[PDB]
Symmetry: D2
Subunit: 390 residues, 4 copies
């Protein structure tokens, strides 16, 4: 049979994997090796597995699974989400090329695009990707890539993938989408015209807060270049077989995890929207979200991340996060535990307040990654902390 | 006490490591986490461990140990040896800069320098680094780095680190040395004036054929840039904590392994030099090596790698590797098992024979990574195969 | 706060665990050590962690979590489910003691009780535990333990835990319940009067088909004896820290997994009950189950295991399992993949047919462990295979 | 070829292992699975791998390697050294049987034999096994097993394996030898007439202080019973595949480790014997050892463990261990780090002083497990601490 014909939950469990033919072992073995042996001089030349830096059976299973889930031809695992992004863009671009990027992107990605790319002669124009006309207006004869993230932090704004793909393609560029926030269970950019999808598997795909890693999915021709040039000759961004095996294990529960994350998040978002100490709640599942209908067409679920603004600015946000007893203070997302952060007092404390404001980070903004706990316990913890903070 | 005051074997065992203060666990715990939690808003801002992509306690132990062993200030672990090299060079260089590199370098490194760097506007001049005058003559006002490997494949030629460091420094450049072949047990480039040392830990440092990884050692100021810019904003070349833990475990036996590798290799090299079917033997421990005295000053042991040429060219080399029963056919080195390869029929089969010849790869050249088996068994296997092949 | 006060899903995620105080690492570190160090002679005497055979911080987290989930005082992890059972019974019993056991128990447990115990002078009487009067009638002055499993293979019959606990206690014996089939998410024997619960974590608790292990939960006084005598001085049945860490990771999703297993199983059970080629379907969620109302009081969900009888006996059962394309042929249960077996042709093939019949294993009986795939795909596979087999 | 024909170092590296046929992976894959799948009903019956509790390809490699190294037919891996011992003895013995055991045995083994065995109707007579006549005099018609350890703590006394084997066999009993202290590199009890060898792999065989585990080696007929009855139906003492893989990795360096341990230990023993503050030194490599010549015939090296008595009794021993700066205070042995303990103040502090004295534990006795550090550093640390303590 062919895994690409089964339902999505069946694919989550089985795609890319099968019992070991030699032993019958059901779990994918951990091929924690650096060296592969040849039977003869002739077999060594013909292969020219050889070396985990080229490929590995455990990692291959993960790559094939994620390719099935994103409806792409091929996958390539990497050492980190950032390595997935930079291996992709450094494979595609050289000195003199140009990229149009969303401004509302992950912080580390922004640093790569704003400082590292221009030092290699690759220029980047940042635009508001919620306005597809700004993408069009920034495209140049040298533009190779349009780069977007959706939903995007810190207010969970959206980008219309299908519309942007059509613009990029008419002007001769590829569209790369960072799909980390959604996972393939909730959004499928390649089905909407994107050429390449990248993820930090560190978040939902692994889901267990114990793996740093990335994945790239796209056409075989591109993935072959990302592997044999990008990984081999540029970043050296290999995923270890053990991390691939842990990610395979974590992704087995992706469907049931995303369903529970999103069911919990919708309940919490509605609680916050009814709370008179909370000025704003940013969540694609609330009908007041400015791009609500686009989200309903593009995403199968509204996600597990919420942002919200607490009354009273910086000191209220600090008092709030210092008053939670169950939510844990951390900067990651997509884990089984609920995580909370207050950027203005945590990650962006040395940034000038007016510079945070232009970046959409108000003094009272809190970001919540909703976990698998009972939502009543999460709501009770938030209610306890909000009441204290105000 | 201070680990930097003890003998080298003591440092191999103990440097960078101590019993866990919280539990007393002797083994370094495997901190297989992506997320680190803060106790309050204030602690989260002060730290701005946070995230394994920034650092991790297991990986920190490995970095500190290797810094002690190379007599450097700081270490930085990476996803692969190639990532150690490219994270280093992409941190140091930008569009318009220049590198002088040895020509006799690892194949993948050559591909990065010959094809990837120039596409980022970084030019590279390749020279014969056994001739320090060629390094001097190639240096330009824009030269930021001189890059060398010693010993170098395929004939185990050497580079005079101290002399080259003095030339590089007089002309305002840094010297980067790939010390993979030797390990810090046998050669210490920083003590001879190199600025930065890189290794593929995939070889001797781990030693067990089950980890792909790299390490960078140098001054704190540079390592901080390689970590917070190179890894964070360019390659995303993180080492996983489990790979760091395996490398810590493998390096515990580095001293006893290198002693046995080199004792075995010297016996095998002398056997091959006495064999009338073997035209040449390349090994720094043989007094006929063209740079023998330099090797005796620069290396504490002559290493575990041998190359040799079998009579009868391509078909004899193929028959030989097809006739071994104990040596395993593979392209890695530094494992506990003896590994053998015949480049002209394996890795370089589609390369034009006259192009292999200019690269020092003759049709009869065999490379041997000597393992920890009884040398009598290795010699008997080689003798059996050589006699058949001729 | 106290984890014992939160909801059950919150407890699944958080109980027994917290961020590492020394580093903030969110994931429980893998303390893969054999040795623990003391700061002084005095600290070494006071502790007399010391040695993973006594205890280990990773394994302690798992033990504490499972104790919370079963509402018991303490937990003890073991090398296998069988070791959990034998460490328990060999701690409790000595030469001259007696056990009353259900006859419908796991095969390996039956072998221990029928052959191993009597060779140590410990006698066992087997009874039909669906009939509590048979338990009472078999109790002797020497009876130390009543041992039950519920639901029990092969027809998923039940045992009334509360009623049996009252009988055992009136006659001075302890009740031990193997709760593997249900997990603490679906049944809590200690809340119904059982004294000790054992599990094979190999099944649902880990859930990922990659760990062999057991756990014991009960009063602190008993668990201390099971640890310091049973494990230390009898079975030497330690769980490795890595297996404990994997089980901690697997149990994070126990609630969402059990919900999906049981939702899928109920759909499949109803499909089979409507199928004219299927003579019988054994599933606690079907109202025709002989102990249906007891199951509704004692179990929060009817479970993920189904047994059923296909028309046409031995050859139909063999043709059926040889015709599935998605279900995998295996003898375990509780994995994320759907597993199927036909005992009469697989595990019990050399047993006399009339001896299988008395054991409740008819020639046409199939056992199904329902996984996390789309139930429509599982049903389509079963329908395809049943139609072929008949 | 056949691994049993090669030299011992070659066997250490290669025995039981080969490149994976399906992939060529050189490292033995980690088959971290609980479940094995069958291709058809017929293959499932024929096998009746099936289940890691029966066997596993990773663990099988370790078992085969250790069988080669001990010159035995078959091996069986276990959860701990204690499980290797109890699985062996509980397989061999039943109610009414008798064991003659050395008195100078590992503490936990003594507890099993003195308290657990008699509660199962199995009687044990303890004798001074340095006097083979005491073994003979204690044998009864019911004696099934003679059990010995050599060298034996706390004074490293010896037992003449060959002489004791002949006595046991003439009287119809099996000889079981715990060979943990020596490893197969230094002593081979089966070659001297022992029937079964057990080890705690926790010590030298793994060697890296990060695995708890055991191994049993003997005839195929016995090992089959220890596996299919002892492990399956009594102790449930399975080794996890990951622990087996780590032990395979650790044992690769067994030969070079034992050579360095013993070279270091002999230097340290001679230093201590020349020290006027040290009243006695117990080490088989010193010619004053009471069984020196027996040790030279039976052991290829004198081992890595030393015991010694410091002048000044209990308080001097406590001051000494509180004054070391490099040696670590711990109760294990066979690790790469040097470990030290003072039983009278650490492990035996609540034992009556006259009861320790009869057990050979004087108030001033120190036990040292010599590691792989520079021996000059170990000697300097001991000298520093001894001078302070006196
Ligand atoms: C966390 C994240 C990344 C970075 O991935 P890493 O695995 O941390 O390198 C990139 N994009 C998004 C949207 C992320 O959330
Ligand atoms: C193997 C090797 C490398 C590459 O290291 P990887 O870990 O394979 O990326 C670089 N330099 C030398 C000298 C090597 O032998
Ligand atoms: C599988 C099972 C066991 C045995 O557990 P192991 O981990 O295989 O030793 C015991 N009881 C039940 C109900 C089981 O399903
Ligand atoms: C440590 C030891 C044991 C016990 O082994 P574990 O792996 O700790 O269960 C048994 N015998 C000897 C000689 C030992 O040193």
């Amino acid at each position: 049979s062919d895994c690409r014909t089964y339902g999505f939950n069946t694919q989550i469990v089985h795609a890319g994997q099968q019992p070991d033919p030699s032993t019958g072992a059901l779990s994918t073995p951990i091929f924690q090796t650096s060296t592969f042996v040849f039977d003869s001089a002739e077999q060594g030349a013909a292969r020219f597995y050889i070396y985990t830096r080229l490929g590995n059976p455990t990692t291959d299973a993960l790559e094939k699974k994620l390719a099935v889930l994103e409806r792409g031809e091929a996958g390539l695992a990497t050492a980190s989400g950032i390595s997935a992004i930079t291996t992709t863009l450094l494979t595609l671009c050289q000195q003199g090329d140009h990229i149009v990027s969303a401004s509302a992107i992950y912080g580390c990605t922004h640093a790569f695009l704003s400082h590292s790319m221009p030092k290699f002669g690759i220029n980047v124009s940042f635009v508001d990707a919620a306005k597809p006309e700004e993408i069009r207006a920034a495209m140049r004869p040298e533009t190779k890539v349009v780069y977007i993230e959706t939903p995007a932090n810190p207010t969970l704004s959206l980008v219309d993938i299908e519309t942007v793909a059509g613009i990029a393609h008419q002007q001769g560029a590829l569209l790369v989408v960072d799909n980390t926030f959604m996972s393939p269970y909730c959004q499928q950019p390649l089905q909407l015209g994107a050429d390449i999808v990248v993820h930090s598997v560190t978040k939902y795909i692994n889901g267990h807060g114990d793996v740093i890693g990335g994945i790239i999915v796209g056409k075989q021709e591109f993935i072959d270049q990302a592997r044999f040039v990008g990984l081999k000759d540029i970043t050296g961004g290999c995923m270890s077989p053990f991390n691939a095996w842990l990610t395979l294990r974590g992704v087995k529960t992706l469907g049931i995890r995303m369903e529970r994350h999103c069911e919990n998040a919708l309940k919490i978002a509605r609680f916050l929207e009814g709370h008179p100490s909370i000025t704003r709640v940013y969540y694609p599942g609330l009908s007041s979200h400015p791009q609500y209908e686009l989200g309903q067409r593009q995403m199968s679920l509204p996600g597990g991340i919420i942002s919200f603004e607490i009354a009273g600015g910086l000191e209220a946000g600090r008092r709030m996060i210092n008053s939670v007893e169950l939510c844990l203070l951390a900067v990651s997302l997509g884990d089984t535990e609920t995580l909370i952060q207050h950027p203005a007092s945590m990650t962006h404390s040395p940034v000038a307040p007016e510079e945070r404001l232009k970046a959409g980070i108000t003094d009272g903004l809190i970001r919540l990654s909703v976990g698998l706990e009972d939502p009543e316990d999460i709501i009770n913890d938030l209610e306890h902390a909000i009441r204290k903070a105000t």
